[PDB]
Design a protein around this ligand. Sequence first.
Ligand code: NAG
Ligand code: NAG
Lengths: 390, 390
Amino acid sequence: LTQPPTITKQSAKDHIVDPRDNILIECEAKGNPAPSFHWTRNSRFFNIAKDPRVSMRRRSGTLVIDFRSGGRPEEYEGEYQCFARNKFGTALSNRIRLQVSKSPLWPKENLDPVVVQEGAPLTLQCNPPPGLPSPVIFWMSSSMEPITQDKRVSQGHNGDLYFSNVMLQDMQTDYSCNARFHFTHTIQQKNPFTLKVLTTRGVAERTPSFMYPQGTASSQMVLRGMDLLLECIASGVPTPDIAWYKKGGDLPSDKAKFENFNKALRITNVSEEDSGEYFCLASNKMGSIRHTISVRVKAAPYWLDEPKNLILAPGEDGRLVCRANGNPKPTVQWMVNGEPLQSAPPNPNREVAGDTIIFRDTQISSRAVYQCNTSNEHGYLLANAFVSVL
Amino acid sequence: LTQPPTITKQSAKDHIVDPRDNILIECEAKGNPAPSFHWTRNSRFFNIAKDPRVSMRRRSGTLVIDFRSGGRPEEYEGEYQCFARNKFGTALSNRIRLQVSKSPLWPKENLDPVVVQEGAPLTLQCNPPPGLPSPVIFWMSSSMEPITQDKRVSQGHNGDLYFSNVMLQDMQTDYSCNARFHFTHTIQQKNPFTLKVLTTRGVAERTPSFMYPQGTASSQMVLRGMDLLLECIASGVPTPDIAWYKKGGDLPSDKAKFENFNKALRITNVSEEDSGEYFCLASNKMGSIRHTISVRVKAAPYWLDEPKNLILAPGEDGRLVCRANGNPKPTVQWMVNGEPLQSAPPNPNREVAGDTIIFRDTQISSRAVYQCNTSNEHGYLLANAFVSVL
Ligand SMILES: *[C@@H]1O[C@H](CO)[C@@H](O)[C@H](O)[C@H]1NC(C)=O
Ligand SMILES: *[C@@H]1O[C@H](CO)[C@@H](O)[C@H](O)[C@H]1NC(C)=O
C-alpha cells in the first residue's frame, strides 16, 4: 500500500526515432496514490498545453507526439526528463536525449577520373555523411554488382577502399561507396569512381608501407565493455600479409577474432586487462615493417553499490551508499525530489559523507525520494531510492 | 532593334527538383526595350515581395528560391507561368508544373513467412511507393547479394517477382524488393520475404497459366513516340517458353526487341502503324495457351503548322495558322498578350476561322504578341507569335 513513486518503465537514455510513426517518450511509475507527471525539455519546464502535438496517457506520464498536422521532429530534438510525484515525494527518470534517425544525402560533387600507375597503391576514400547510428558501408559497381574483396583490395572500418597494389583488372568495374542505414534501411550512393590505370611496363617489387594507420604509431581509447578494433592496411607490390601481437603477452584466443583478410583484429568485451601495446607486421618479401598501437581503457560508470529503497522503523538509523566504479573515477551528486541537496529543506537527522548518506533517528517526517547521479566524462548512472518510515 | 518580347529560355514543362540545391524556375526573353517580368502560381498572381525565399534576376525573370532559413519545397509545388511584357505586347511561357523529387519510405509492415508447395507457382508482389519519376527496381538478398534471374524466375516491369515453378534452391536466399531513384540515387528496401518451400513428392507436370497479364486478353493505350511494352509471364512445371506475334502482320524487326528472357517485347518509337492486336504463346509441353493484347495508339499534339512572328508592311494582309496533329484531335485557343481573345480590345482588321487568323489592312496599331494553345487529353503546345508593322 503506502509506497512513494518508483519508475516502472522509461524510454532509452539515447532514444532514437525515424520521422515515421510518431514519437513515444515513455515514462511510467508505481505509487500508493497514482502519481502525477510533468516534464522538462532542455532543463526548462516543458509546457504540454501550448503544444498541440504532444499529449499524456492513461494514468501515466508517457508522452505521445503527432505530426499529422504540419510538423517536423527536427525541431523536437532535445533532453527530456520525467518527474513522478505523489503525496510523499518525487522520483526522476533519466535524461532522455531524443534524436532523429537521419539518413542524409551526399554533398553534390563532380568527381575526378582516377588515374594511377599500375602496381602503385591507391585509396578510394569514402567519407560518408554522419547519420545515427553509423551506417553500414559497402562498395558496389554503379550497376549494382558486388565488388569482390581480398588481401589485395579491401575496405577499412571508416569505409575507405584500399588498394595495396593496383592491377589491370581493377578497370573491370567502377566503384561507388554505399551507406545502408540501420532502421530506415535507406541506402545512399556516392558518385562512382572511374579508374583509368596506366601500364608503365614494370613489376617493380617494392617495400611495404602503411596505408591507413599513418606512419609508425597510433593511440586508441576504448570504453570498458565495448569492442576494440585494430587495423593495419599495407601497400606492397608482392601483396603484403598482416600479423598481430601484444607486447609482453598473448592475444586472448577467445575474445580475439581476425577479420578483414587478417587486416583487422577485434577484441570483444574489453576490460582493463586488455589495455597496453599491440603491434602489427606488414610482412612483404622485400621487407617487413611494424605499427604500434597504444590502447588505453577508460570506463563509463557501472554500479558497485546501487542505493535501494529504505523502509525503516521510527528511530532506526538508515544509510544510502551510492558507489560506482569508473575511469575516470565517478562523481556523486545527491538530490531530494529533484531539488539539489544544497538547496533542500534542512534536516538534522541527515549526515552526508560524499558517496554515503546516513539517516539517524528516522522519524515521521523525512519521507522523500532521494536521487543519485554518479558520472564521469563518459557517462552517468541515476538511481532513485525512497526513505519511508513504518 | 524594334522587336516585341520573345522567350529565350525557360524551365521544362515538367520541372522536377530534389530538395538539395535551391530551385531555379527559369524564364528569359529578348525585346527592343528590356522586358519586365511577373509570374502566376496556380492561376493567381504570384507575389514575389511578401515571399522571402524567392527573388528575380539580372535583367531577366528567372526566379530563385532559398530554403536556408527554415523552409520546405513541399509547400512550393504548383503551376508556374512567366509573363514577358514590353511597350508593344506580352509573351507567355509554358505552364511550369514544379514538383519535388520524392524518394519515400515503405509503409511499416510485418510480412508473412512465405510457404508454397514445391513446383507450384508464386508471385512476390513488390508494390513500391510512388516517387517521381518511377524508380528503377531490382531484387537482392537482405545481405546485398544479387538475385539471379532466368526463364523460370524473373521480374515484371511493375517490379513483382515471378516464379513460374518454385524449386528447392529458392531457399538459398531471402528476397527484398529494392527501388533505386533516378537523380537522388537513394535506394529504399522493403522487408525481406522468407521462403519456406514444402516438398510434396511430385513433379506433377502441369499445363501453363498466365501469371501477370490476367486471363485471356488485355488492352493498352500508348502515346505516339513513346515505347510500347508487352509482357507475358507464365506458370508451368516444365518451364514455359514465350513467343510473340502481331495479328495479320509481322513484328518490325528493327523497332522491336525481345527483353526479359523473352517474357517481354518492346517497340521503340511507336506510331499509328504499330497499333492493333498482338498475342503471345506460353508454349509448355502439356499445352500452349495464348494472351491477346489490344494496342491503341493515341497522340499528344505535335506541330504541323506552328505560328511564326509576323513583320508586315502597313496595309498588307497577314495570317497566323496554328495547327497540330493529335489523337484526339487538338483544340485551338487564341490569346492576345495573355488575355483570352474573347475578352480582348476589339479589332476590325481581324477575322478568326478556328485555327486560322487573318489580319487585313495591318496598321500602325495592332502590334501585339498572340498566343496559341493546341491541346488534347494528353498534352498541349504553346506558341508565341507577334504582329509587328514596319
Ligand atoms: C548527471 O550529471 C552529469 C554531469 O553533471 C550530467 O551530464 C547528467 O546529465 C546528469 N544526469 C542526470 C539525469 O541528472
Ligand atoms: C492549354 O489548354 C489546356 C486545356 O485547356 C490546359 O490544360 C493547358 O494548361 C493550357 N496551356 C497553357 C500554357 O495555356
